[PDB]
Amino acid sequence: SWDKDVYPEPPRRTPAPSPQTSLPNPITYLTKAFDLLVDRPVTLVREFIERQHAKNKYYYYHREFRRVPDITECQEKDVLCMFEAEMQWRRDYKVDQEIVNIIQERLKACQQREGESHRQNCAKELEQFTQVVKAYQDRYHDLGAHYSARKCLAKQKQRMLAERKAAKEA
């Protein structure tokens, strides 16, 4: 239904019931009523619908954008090359937003799932979220509403020069 590698879930461990009482558990009798009254008729309706979908099977595809030269390879004021580099950079910018969203959802699901032990059991998800947010911040933060590949490249070069200067200082 979805890629378990992209949205992982640890193996589930529900303990077997060990009733130490004699009163019946009302939640077991409500589960059977739910399965009998709610689940089964719902399942039957869905099975009818899926049979119709089987009769008429057609496909859609995930659009693949071929890579084009980056803005670094574009000559100044060459709009035709700049246009394709700029449009590609915008597509990558949008994809990176959804990468951060994926990692944020991993983190949030872990917090709810681990319950009272989340501070210790979600360290990996927190670490991965911390790193991706840093990388995203380096690429795209502080560009402004009129952001572009040019302004992103200028930000990168400013950071690269500072790093080069700090390397010499050490």
Binding site: K77, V79, L80, F83, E84, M87
Partner: protein
């Protein structure tokens, strides 16, 4: 329309607009040089036409 049509229609628009913008900047430079030097078709202010001169021998020799 579809993305490919709009995308490649945009490149056609950009090419025309960039060609025009370059030509606008060049006409300004051409106009500056022609006006400054007077060596082109534009800013050619007329001088007296030499076909009005009479070259026949005159009433006196020295001319």
């Amino acid at each position: 329309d579809g993305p490919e049509k709009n995308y490649e229609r945009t490149m056609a628009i950009l090419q025309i607009e960039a060609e025009k913008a370059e030509l606008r900047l060049k006409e300004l430079e051409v106009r500056r040089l022609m006006r400054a030097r007077g060596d082109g078709p534009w800013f050619h202010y007329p001088t007296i036409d030499k076909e009005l001169i009479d070259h026949s021998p005159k009433a006196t020799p020295d001319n």
